Enzyme design. Sequence first.
Site, mmCIF file in Angstrom:
data_model
loop_
_atom_site.group_PDB
_atom_site.id
_atom_site.type_symbol
_atom_site.label_atom_id
_atom_site.label_comp_id
_atom_site.label_asym_id
_atom_site.label_seq_id
_atom_site.Cartn_x
_atom_site.Cartn_y
_atom_site.Cartn_z
ATOM 1 N N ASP A 109 -10.036 -7.472 75.362
ATOM 2 C CA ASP A 109 -10.948 -8.211 76.203
ATOM 3 C C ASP A 109 -11.742 -7.241 77.104
ATOM 4 O O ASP A 109 -11.406 -6.075 77.251
ATOM 5 C CB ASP A 109 -10.259 -9.323 77.003
ATOM 6 C CG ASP A 109 -9.373 -8.827 78.147
ATOM 7 O OD1 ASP A 109 -8.753 -7.744 78.000
ATOM 8 O OD2 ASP A 109 -9.237 -9.505 79.229
ATOM 9 N N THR A 125 4.071 -6.005 81.874
ATOM 10 C CA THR A 125 2.609 -6.144 82.111
ATOM 11 C C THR A 125 2.363 -5.957 83.576
ATOM 12 O O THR A 125 3.280 -6.048 84.396
ATOM 13 C CB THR A 125 2.008 -7.517 81.601
ATOM 14 O OG1 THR A 125 0.567 -7.435 81.549
ATOM 15 C CG2 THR A 125 2.437 -8.693 82.434
ATOM 16 N N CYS A 171 23.708 5.530 75.393
ATOM 17 C CA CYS A 171 23.029 5.758 76.717
ATOM 18 C C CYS A 171 24.017 5.867 77.819
ATOM 19 O O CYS A 171 24.728 6.869 77.920
ATOM 20 C CB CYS A 171 21.911 4.796 76.837
ATOM 21 S SG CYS A 171 20.731 5.268 78.113
ATOM 22 N N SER A 193 -13.072 -6.351 80.829
ATOM 23 C CA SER A 193 -12.698 -6.525 82.220
ATOM 24 C C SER A 193 -13.224 -5.304 82.998
ATOM 25 O O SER A 193 -14.423 -4.993 82.810
ATOM 26 C CB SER A 193 -11.160 -6.767 82.352
ATOM 27 O OG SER A 193 -10.479 -5.753 81.657
ATOM 28 N N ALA A 241 8.605 -2.205 97.475
ATOM 29 C CA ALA A 241 8.400 -2.617 96.079
ATOM 30 C C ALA A 241 9.723 -2.965 95.387
ATOM 31 O O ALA A 241 9.788 -3.936 94.602
ATOM 32 C CB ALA A 241 7.709 -1.511 95.339
ATOM 33 N N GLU A 271 20.389 -0.335 69.292
ATOM 34 C CA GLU A 271 20.608 -1.745 69.411
ATOM 35 C C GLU A 271 19.438 -2.467 70.036
ATOM 36 O O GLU A 271 19.353 -3.700 69.944
ATOM 37 C CB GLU A 271 21.874 -2.011 70.206
ATOM 38 C CG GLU A 271 21.775 -1.932 71.722
ATOM 39 C CD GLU A 271 21.646 -0.506 72.293
ATOM 40 O OE1 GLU A 271 21.459 0.512 71.538
ATOM 41 O OE2 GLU A 271 21.756 -0.382 73.536
ATOM 42 N N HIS A 276 18.605 4.040 72.226
ATOM 43 C CA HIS A 276 19.152 2.682 72.043
ATOM 44 C C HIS A 276 18.860 2.029 70.662
ATOM 45 O O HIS A 276 17.885 1.257 70.504
ATOM 46 C CB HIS A 276 18.554 1.783 73.105
ATOM 47 C CG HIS A 276 19.149 1.905 74.448
ATOM 48 N ND1 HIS A 276 18.507 2.536 75.519
ATOM 49 C CD2 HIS A 276 20.303 1.433 74.937
ATOM 50 C CE1 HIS A 276 19.242 2.396 76.609
ATOM 51 N NE2 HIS A 276 20.316 1.720 76.282
ATOM 52 N N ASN A 295 -6.960 -12.021 78.385
ATOM 53 C CA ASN A 295 -5.867 -11.074 78.157
ATOM 54 C C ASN A 295 -4.776 -11.650 77.243
ATOM 55 O O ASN A 295 -4.099 -10.892 76.558
ATOM 56 C CB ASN A 295 -5.234 -10.581 79.469
ATOM 57 C CG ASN A 295 -5.777 -9.232 79.939
ATOM 58 O OD1 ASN A 295 -6.285 -8.430 79.155
ATOM 59 N ND2 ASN A 295 -5.666 -8.997 81.232
HETATM 60 N N1 LIG Z 1 1.251 -1.769 87.980
HETATM 61 C C1 LIG Z 1 1.549 -1.745 86.648
HETATM 62 N N2 LIG Z 1 2.812 -1.688 86.173
HETATM 63 C C2 LIG Z 1 3.002 -1.757 84.839
HETATM 64 N N3 LIG Z 1 2.078 -1.845 83.877
HETATM 65 C C3 LIG Z 1 0.812 -1.860 84.318
HETATM 66 C C4 LIG Z 1 0.484 -1.780 85.711
HETATM 67 N N4 LIG Z 1 -0.863 -1.774 85.829
HETATM 68 C C5 LIG Z 1 -1.360 -1.830 84.602
HETATM 69 N N5 LIG Z 1 -0.348 -1.883 83.703
HETATM 70 C C6 LIG Z 1 -0.518 -1.987 82.274
HETATM 71 O O1 LIG Z 1 -1.347 -0.928 81.749
HETATM 72 C C7 LIG Z 1 -2.244 -1.465 80.766
HETATM 73 C C8 LIG Z 1 -3.648 -1.338 81.262
HETATM 74 O O2 LIG Z 1 -3.844 -2.136 82.435
HETATM 75 P P1 LIG Z 1 -5.299 -2.650 82.845
HETATM 76 O O3 LIG Z 1 -6.402 -1.776 82.262
HETATM 77 O O4 LIG Z 1 -5.219 -3.071 84.279
HETATM 78 O O5 LIG Z 1 -5.240 -4.036 81.961
HETATM 79 P P2 LIG Z 1 -6.521 -5.031 81.680
HETATM 80 O O6 LIG Z 1 -7.802 -4.280 82.019
HETATM 81 O O7 LIG Z 1 -6.325 -5.476 80.216
HETATM 82 O O8 LIG Z 1 -6.383 -6.188 82.604
HETATM 83 C C9 LIG Z 1 -1.830 -2.902 80.511
HETATM 84 O O9 LIG Z 1 -0.875 -2.972 79.378
HETATM 85 C C10 LIG Z 1 -1.138 -3.310 81.817
HETATM 86 O O10 LIG Z 1 -0.152 -4.341 81.593
HETATM 87 MG MG LIG Z 2 -7.441 -6.687 79.051
HETATM 88 MG MG LIG Z 3 -7.036 -6.845 84.412
HETATM 89 MG MG LIG Z 4 -8.305 -2.297 81.921
#
Ligand SMILES: Nc1ncnc2c1ncn2[C@@H]1O[C@H](COP(=O)(O)OP(=O)(O)O)[C@@H](O)[C@H]1O
Ligand SMILES: [Mg+2]
Ligand SMILES: [Mg+2]
Ligand SMILES: [Mg+2]
Length: 1289
Positions: A878, A395, A1129, A880, A317, A1256, A1254, A716
């Site tokens: 939304d 995200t 920091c 999903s 990763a 800034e 932080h 989204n």
């Molecule tokens: N692998 C990840 N790393 C970072 N943020 C994540 C990850 N998976 C989900 N998130 C975040 O956690 C929140 C919930 O995700 P999820 O329920 O999958 O989103 P959605 O159902 O709106 O598509 C969102 O803000 C998403 O960007």
């Molecule tokens: Mg969503």
């Molecule tokens: Mg999703």
């Molecule tokens: Mg979700």
Amino acid sequence: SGLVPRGSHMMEILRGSPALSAFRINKLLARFQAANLQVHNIYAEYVHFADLNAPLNDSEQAQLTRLLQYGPALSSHTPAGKLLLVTPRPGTISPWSSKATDIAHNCGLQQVDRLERGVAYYIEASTLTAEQWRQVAAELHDRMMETVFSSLTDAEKLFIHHQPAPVSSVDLLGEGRQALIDANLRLGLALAEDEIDYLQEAFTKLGRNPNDIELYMFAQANSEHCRHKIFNADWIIDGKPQPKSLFKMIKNTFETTPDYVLSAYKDNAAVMEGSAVGRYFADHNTGRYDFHQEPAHILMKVETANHPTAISPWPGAATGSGGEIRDEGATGRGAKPKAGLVGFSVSNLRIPGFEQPWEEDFGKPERIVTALDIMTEGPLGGAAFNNEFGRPALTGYFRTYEEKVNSHNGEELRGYHKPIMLAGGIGNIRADHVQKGEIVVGAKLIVLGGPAMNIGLDLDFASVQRDNPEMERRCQEVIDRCWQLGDANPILFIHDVGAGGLSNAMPELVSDGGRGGKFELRDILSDEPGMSPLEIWCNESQERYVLAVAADQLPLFDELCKRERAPYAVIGDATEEQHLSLHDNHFDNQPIDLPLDVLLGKTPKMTRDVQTLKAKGDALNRADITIADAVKRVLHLPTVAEKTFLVTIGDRTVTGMVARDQMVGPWQVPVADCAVTTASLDSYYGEAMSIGERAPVALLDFAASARLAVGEALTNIAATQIGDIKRIKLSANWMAAAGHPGEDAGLYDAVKAVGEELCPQLGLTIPVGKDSMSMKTRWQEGNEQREMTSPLSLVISAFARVEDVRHTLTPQLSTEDNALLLIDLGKGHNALGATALAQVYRQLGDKPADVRDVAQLKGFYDAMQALVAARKLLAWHDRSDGGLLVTLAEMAFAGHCGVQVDIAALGDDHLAALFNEELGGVIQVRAEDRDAVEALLAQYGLADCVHYLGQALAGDRFVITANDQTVFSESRTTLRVWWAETTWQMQRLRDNPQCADQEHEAKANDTDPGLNVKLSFDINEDIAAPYIATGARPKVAVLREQGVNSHVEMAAAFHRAGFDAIDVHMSDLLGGRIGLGNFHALVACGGFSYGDVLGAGEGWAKSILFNHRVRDEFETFFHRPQTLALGVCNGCQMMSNLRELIPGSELWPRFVRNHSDRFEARFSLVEVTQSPSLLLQGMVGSQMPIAVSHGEGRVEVRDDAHLAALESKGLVALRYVDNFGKVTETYPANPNGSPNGITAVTTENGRVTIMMPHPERVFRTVANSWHPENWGEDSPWMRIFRNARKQLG
Ligand SMILES: Nc1ncnc2c1ncn2[C@@H]1O[C@H](COP(=O)(O)OP(=O)(O)O)[C@@H](O)[C@H]1O
Ligand SMILES: [Mg+2]
Ligand SMILES: [Mg+2]
Ligand SMILES: [Mg+2]
């Protein structure tokens, strides 16, 4: 310390500090007990090994010993019991080693050839057999990266000098075709018969035997990974030849919608138009930071790392993100990463003691890790790269799936034993750098970055990657310096180094310019002298770029690299002749000597002749389903469940440009549907990122799954202010088990569904993408052959220029008078096939969701854009995974309120109405706006889809009715805690369980008022304005070391307060180009100097202490009567290691590993306390949130005497408070465990202040994750910088 001969060198052994806190020791003991290993006690210490090329004098030795003192002051124990020393495996060099060695060298210890670290375990277990000792040793190390030794002196094996291995020829001339057959097997070239044919004929024509290196190079260039045969194949489907390749169908979206696209399919990122804004950076000639008003265009890319992550998930990763970051910076003639995204798909977690009723253990290959281990180590790896490189991760997605289902090929195991590890992002680029330049004949050909090692060539060691993010930050600074020269940018062409190493990247670079190249093997930087020419040329070592510069620009390029401490080597010259030569000065021979047309010549196109398979679904068996039980199960599906374990581990504030992160509202609930950044530090224009994905739907309907991925990316992103849908650009990442029955036809249908149909109809371009075509795993389980095969898994990432970041809506419900409206783009189909609901009852069901009406999807988008711009929405979320039920629940969580909703209009089937995953979502509007909003929706053709549900209400009730029947009713807190249990359990097994538990339990207290502010001053009063109005601008030295990443926004904060911010690198002070005597103010910036190796901030500080000249310079500055300094920091950590130079600092604490044992990226509540600090004047008694982003921020004192003395002296300046306003040590309100909440201290005279958070990053209101509605442009934190200006006078 120990010091023994080590070949032509000497190895010193230096004992370090205790390595494990008490919770980790207890976990080890509990694991030994569970395995019936009778272990009485265990204790661990770090041990350091220094391989020296010449002796150290007494002063040097004391320096080395001091460099190797770091970390939390856990109590030492006298060693007892059996020693097991764990180290990296011989023939590998840890990233820890690279960075620790760099620190020694920058502290003047050139006699250190290499430092390495191990962990000495002392185990008391008198009763154990030699086999049981081997099981003990197995628990204490990672078999893919580490080895166990029985003596400290055994570490000499890590530093063995090997002579270079020669090139080997493959004897085609002396043995015929069999030589190629043999080499194919021996070297693992994975060549097809026609490729063996091609190679035989090429080398026959040349009249000489191929070298191993030449065959390996050819094989990596012709892999499915590298050459994309499937995406370029001809197809026949159900007996009909098809007219387009998959790639041509993707490009169809660009042929249809070229709008706003600047670059597609001709670089390792796409570029689209951005906005004209002030790009902020330090001028090459002045070193002063200034705004440059110009277009900041937007690049985008999304990569995967699926195979390596199955083997070694942390570096898998980590390099997934790291390689994608290189793709970004190598866009055009150089560009700048801005923000990231992260995705995981894995099999069922099966968390010990928290097994869920849908999960069954089906086994797995011995050679791969578990789904749980991927989700433990993988996110940490991705975050280690994003945090240490310095891009916010804003995200993402995380899906679990593993079930035996009746899909396209009948009943089989479908899942993700080979995971999806997805990493992507956006960057900014200048208009004149988007196009690759010409490579002039005679251009110098350079490798920018890290050493080569033998990486990428127990069981699958070749798939164990290695990340050093700080090396890549150093490179990015050089790239930045280059693009910041504008017309004088010396980079003619740049490309990332990835698959195939130099053997792909250099030939690609010259070929892309229509040139050849001649190279010298021994000019390449190597950390492994034993390597063969094949290993040198072909290894997949990380943090490298290739570029071409004119010879006359080499002195400039060298100056840039040296100032950043970025390693580089000139390794060849571009030639007119389209030939590739690699010479070896050591062996006086020519490992490669090939026309490029031979090397890059193609075997014929693939033809795939395949047939459709279509699953008939089975109706959902509802025998054991009730609405109440469904709600509980669905909230427990990781796909649905709260994601905090993936979110707070990754920085969300670096750059100072993050407007909308995952965490939403006063209760910081991770439900934001998309990310938003500002385009600059002086604009409300910006960029947005979202993701759509729906793989399980592909187990029923391939094309529906691809349409829903596109649809969900759009839902989204929809409550962000963009305007024209043609501004939204997609990455399409295709994961499949190509060859698995039914998948190939499914893939073709899905690509056609989006490329030929849906995206052109909507006006969506797909200008970038990737494919990963072997998404299955096979192993022997009983006597039986077993297989785990992924669904076809399209991930869409959507990217867009944003018109006004301030107008973004979130799921945070208001409780003012309101209406909740469902937009049901399902049109009442209410499908339950391939839903979370189905999954959690071990089923697939019958018919999935789909895009039901293309015009209405577009109408939805446009109506939302109209509502956003007109400011008619209070909230959006939304639908999903988990359906309307989860959408409404998540909104109530984010609003910390209740809902009262009626669903009688959504059909008689309440289960299907609540749990279908059709497109759409819930808007919240002011009650007075309901009729107008409904008329607006009706204008876009949506009336039939729109349904008034009810209202958000203060309190704790989540109520769903249908006429006079209660369908479902529960405590919102209860639901919110159930939804948190996954992240609780993940945190608990991964981090300090006390912290995991405190964080979880706080969620169950409904009286938590959320983040809230108290201000002791006027946030809008620019106290610096009368000074600024004079035009007199004092300088501030914005100090940075290699690996610092937060210097730009620090500069911009001081700039807004009236300073001339000067870029001062530690190399500048060391080289005499800057002296602190010319400054009255200095700021030490944030980041990961040296990757924090040897203790965060310690390498930076000791590099100053151990150079008597620079030391004296700092000491002089600090002893002046009117100078001001701030440390933030990493700079706070650094300055805490300089007490000896700072008057009035004798009581300062140390800053060490957080109590949670995890990086914490939080938006934390602090209070300004009474202290002498001149920078916090006027703000005492204020309470407001601030950006926190650190792993080593815990205040550590020698003893209570020291804590009491610090406190009585009155030098504490900031403290963490909980939302009730009390000083706290409870987590994560206090994110790091600091006693008395301490997180800033000052000196006796108030002239120097250091703090962990932080300010800034959050001086701009728009960059505060949550803030009061009535704030203007400035947050409270702007006052710190204004105070500094006024103080100077
Ligand atoms: N692998 C990840 N790393 C970072 N943020 C994540 C990850 N998976 C989900 N998130 C975040 O956690 C929140 C919930 O995700 P999820 O329920 O999958 O989103 P959605 O159902 O709106 O598509 C969102 O803000 C998403 O960007
Ligand atoms: Mg969503
Ligand atoms: Mg999703
Ligand atoms: Mg979700």
